[model samples]
Target chain A: RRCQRCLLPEKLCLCSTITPAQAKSRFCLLMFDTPMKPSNTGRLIADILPDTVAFQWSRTEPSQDLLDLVQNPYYQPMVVFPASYADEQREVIFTPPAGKPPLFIMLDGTWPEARKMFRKSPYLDNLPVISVDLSRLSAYRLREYCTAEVAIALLDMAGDTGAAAGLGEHFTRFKTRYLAGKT
Target chain B: RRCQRCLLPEKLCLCSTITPAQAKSRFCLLMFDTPMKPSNTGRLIADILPDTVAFQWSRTEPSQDLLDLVQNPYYQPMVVFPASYADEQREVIFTPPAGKPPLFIMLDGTWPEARKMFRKSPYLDNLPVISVDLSRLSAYRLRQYCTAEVAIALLDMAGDTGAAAGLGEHFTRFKTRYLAGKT
Candidate 1:
């Protein structure tokens, strides 16, 4: 049976693996409903970061809460998508901008799904789309590294190295538990 | 000068190349706002399929029109997405299901974005996902074959072979004109 909080099988549950940390920049996950299973690493972001908010994607309707958050004066929303999609003017920033706290909007899903979210969501259009340089190959091979791995990178970029490190360790432990359960 | 109707440069406009075809199965495109440009082939689906409805994706709000259509008794909404994302219960059918006319709901955007649309849109959760067998390589190499090609395949599956053929021919001509204009 699935664990109530983590949504993973009871034996594969990694709820105890999380190490919370304070982050300078906030996180907003624009998630698809599919990968909400306990195995997905995106849940780890919410576990580690105090200011993480998740919203489901839709074609016709948008969440008022998400819109209000984006419109909030204190936070500057920054969309994180592949660098190739952005035109020349949208600068991909590695570090958070000074003064205002940056709200990193992550399109959390499979690669194609993320692209669809980036393209379809008009509210995200005006925001700057940040892309990180993935010089090295990904360590995790089970699925693509866009979800949790991207969150870790964003945390590090926002000067939350401790949070990033904690999430990374949690991810490694979760992967081990998940694989063991599969076998 | 850019053609307002096609969003293509005047010389590259393939508006005349379009051959509108009658189809039994309707199409509803869950589109991302960013790829609404004329250059996008999604416009081609709208051009050919008279019953096609395009709705913008949002995380908070959903389109009432789309919701109404999905709930309508006259049509059965079938989500067109990659088969790998779905479970065994949600069989990916190539042909239209028996009974009500099938409404092919396509997530129109990049692969990642489409995946997000398929997962996040709760309204689409109950609908059966349709995936075409792409064993053969795609001929349209200018951009990935997601929008028009998928619609064409669905049209054929719904016994609209003539419509599919017409759209395929139009796509070839459009690609040729687009490439020539770029040189």
Candidate 2:
């Protein structure tokens, strides 16, 4: 099917042009099975960044290979979500200028999917959740179902204004170019 | 730039056409970062299957949202990897069916990055660690250093012989199609 906005074939989405910004933010997409289906926003995120990564959530602890990646002396990891009551007082609480490039772990899927991912994987229990308290409307118009606010909020919490804007622009452009022309 | 293997533009790679014979299992990619890069493997998985779903791994108590996904009345949740000492002693030992579809959760990233991902994320503590017992050579020829045999072994543990072969084909095709001619 042609994309509603740019009218490109599904394989040639214009959204692919939204290149990765020069920001310190690195995204980790945790997708549910269904959301990874063709034409999903979760996959769309993969189109925009060179640093973004994707993983399937499992209800198990770290594997040796997974441990190897986590312990790799590379990027710092941060869970992009809301802080639980206990996490509010943790040292890793989100504060502007946190001084390190954040490896934002975004749970991508339906709200229920996101929740299922969080619970099934016990490895995320103690991680501090970072929330972006933005007062704006979400710009995602692909399905008119989910808003861009979530991504925006996630970027905000990561202290990545550049990424947040890029994501927002992508969503806006997607809506204007594709959704607007849809019958 | 077009994809070396698929011949699609770098931005529009439809390399998903390569599929191996069906194996007795499936692997889940818990992509941390970089895999989300438009031209990465995590995205390739999304392009490949109905069985694969990616989810962000957290390090805290299960969130209400995550719990819901796991509780959904579909697909059994089974953790992959070698059984930890504790797991060995547990009453329930998960074994892949002779020809059933198995779920493999792979944490995608470089070695160190994964370690850090593990240390800070405590939510995974509750889940049993499945230590992979594969000693096969690695099949990942992306770099001379990544052994394809290792990747295949991991896939085998997940009972995904077909997927393993497919991944090998993906690497081979990618090498012959893109890497060979481009460089």
Candidate 3:
């Protein structure tokens, strides 16, 4: 099997074998219906963390499994959102203590896809959308886009502020430059 | 330039590009001099995040540059240590609030090298060491002494958690079998 992006054989493909960190931090991928397929980033998160859980967002209400997982006593729950969003304000003002474990619910897909998930997922309205306020470049080096700056920033913020460490120089530079529209 | 680990050419290397995001978190790697060379976990960290800095530990007192870097008001540095050290009684602590940016100083090397670095580095004495209590199995797959696991786990605890978002599944399967000692 060859990588779709690089056309390298599976054995030699960096994307298929680029193993990242698998620590205590848990990532809950709120994938769009179409994004749950193998091509999506949600699949990547699940591939890395043993504790990651991916759920398809619905137009009406969240699936029972999502609600159960959100309320699951075993995991802490958080939503990744834009800094300007209202919920971000609430979380910033009423942030939880550091020691308490939180499940980071990352909405996965393109901006439109993610926005659809956010708008459709009724349960998300009440959940605290945690926004990371990073001013540095992003760490993700796969795709390039404008709004993606926030996603990468949030990921770094989670690592920076939470238990996981932030991305390294290469990732940061690529992200920063990409955000700056250099590459 | 192909990634040493994954062997994808530069254009194909996931390290070359990224989804840019502003990172608020920062990580400082206190690596054994050897790890900064090619094919080291420190390089992997450098490859993944843009904000990370890899500093080689020396036998002499910490360099003025090192001191200045650690003391920089921009970052909050913390030493990564195991739970067993007797002197760590007061140094290690739980994760703090989000407001405090953690500059994780991971001691990257063999046990003996780390011990040597810890004892000889007088400058590191005053700073608080953060000991991670990770209960999960390690995710690294390398030689038997578990160098990969230690490196990956240290990064995990130090907050290089974005790797989890795009981790490849093959590694997970390999880790599972590796932990089981499958040949």
Candidate 4:
């Protein structure tokens, strides 16, 4: 048996290291792959952001459920993507839309998988896309970011700094602990 | 008056320059912007692929018609996209599926607009994605390809070289004629 959050043995699970924080921001994780795997990072995202909910991405079937969720009046949704893929003229913003708190739609997979998800889902095109300005911040010196870093970055950009800091710390700890035996 | 295919004045029209031929391919042009503009290349694509039909891309409203068109049993619809946006491991193929010819779902507008269209429509994500390997071919040295080049490349990859060549020649001539007036 495997731990969902921590890939290490169940006895050595670091699940308790990161506590769920009641945060101001919201997350709608669109899963490309199954969350049952040991390599998943969505578990950590869910751990830190208690409001987080996930839905499996269906390519062939109807996404009517996601369609309804994104259109609800309560939350202003933004799709998270790298700026390079979005056109130079296309709007990619960190500033939350007026009158509602931002609910980020995070794609759970590698960057390429996220891009594939971005390309096929016509429903996602109209939404505001947000990406961390990696060039401006040295926090992630390397270009590619994992789901954990992306969520943390979005939280930071939305001015939920306290939540971001805790989430970031958890990511770092998770990485160290998870990779200890493998590397 | 503007020439529909050539984009030149009615007097200098290149409409008759390229003759249409029946081909093995089908094209479903998803329009991102108005087709009435002078610079649009879809007019030419429609000319060559006489079976080509188009629908306006609506970001806010329902794409039910497009959804139904894509789902119809008659076509094995494929969304045209660049390889970079799709995952390296993603199944991007030029091979036609069994019992059906390919129907390319082309996104009109600039590369950015195409990317935008690719990103938002969840339905588009599930269909087979096809892209020509620009790195292997020297026909277009430039990395960023226009819609004409993309369609031509896809046609060439699909082994409809005759259509691709004619389309390419028309593009070259149209550029020369269209720019003659601009300069």
* Best candidate, TM-score: 1
Q: Which segments of candidate 2 are over 4 A away from where they belong? A: A2-12, A38-40, A61-66, A69-74, A84-92, A136-148, A156-159, B1-183
Q: Residue B77, candidate 4: how far off, in angstroms?
A: 83
Q: By TM-score, how accurate is candidate 2?
A: 0.39
Top DockQ model: 3
TM-score against truth, every candidate = 0.46, 0.39, 0.38, 0.45
Candidates in order have lDDT scores of: 0.72, 0.50, 0.52, 0.71
Model 4 vs. true fold: TM: 0.45
DockQ of 2: 0.01
Taking chain A by itself, what TM-score does each prediction score?
A: 0.86, 0.68, 0.63, 0.85
DockQ of each: 0.01, 0.01, 0.01, 0.01
lDDT tens digits, residue span A1-183, model 4: 446547764534666666767667799888888646556676678878877878888776737878998888789888888767886666788565767888888888777778888888878778878866443224533233667777777776677777776777677556544543343
**Docking outcome class, model 3:** incorrect
- Compared with the true structure, what per-residue lDDT tens digits does model 3 show for residues B73-132? 666676666656738354666552245666767666767877777777776777777665
Q: Rank the candidates by TM-score, best first.
A: 1, 4, 2, 3
Better of 2 and 4 by TM-score: 4
Task: State the DockQ, from 0 to 1, for candidate 3.
Answer: 0.01
- Could you give candidate 3's per-residue lDDT for residues A75-128 as a string of tens digits? 656777665655433554233236656677777777788777766776666667
Tens-digit lDDT track of model 2 for B83-168 = 54333443334444344344544555545545555445443344444455454334332222122333455565665666666665
True contacts kept of each: 0.00, 0.00, 0.00, 0.00
